[PDB]
Amino acid sequence: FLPFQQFGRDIADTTDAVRDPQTLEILDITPCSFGGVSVITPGTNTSNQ
């Protein structure tokens, strides 16, 4: 950051980085979630694998 800047924003205009007010260091912000898994099944009428 430049010495007078405290925030950082991404192309979506949402915050992604901050400055710690006491140590003056930069921190990234990342989501904690992962819902999009894909499940391959051969049909429950045949097996439960």
Binding site: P31, C32, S33, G35, G36
Partner: protein, 49 residues
């Protein structure tokens, strides 16, 4: 134009040309609960309407 006159070619030419065509576009996927409420738990219960 006349009524007893005809024109005939005595020679020829070989020609090569091109033609472009689209076939497919980009595939995309979406997850509402991440797009709409990001990582909030309070907004999930309201979106569940």
């Amino acid at each position: 134009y006349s009524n007893n006159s005809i024109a005939i070619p005595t020679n020829f030419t070989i020609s090569v040309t091109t033609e472009i065509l689209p076939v497919s576009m980009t595939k995309t996927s979406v997850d509402c609960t991440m797009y709409i409420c990001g990582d909030s738990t309070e907004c999930s219960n309201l979106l569940l309407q």
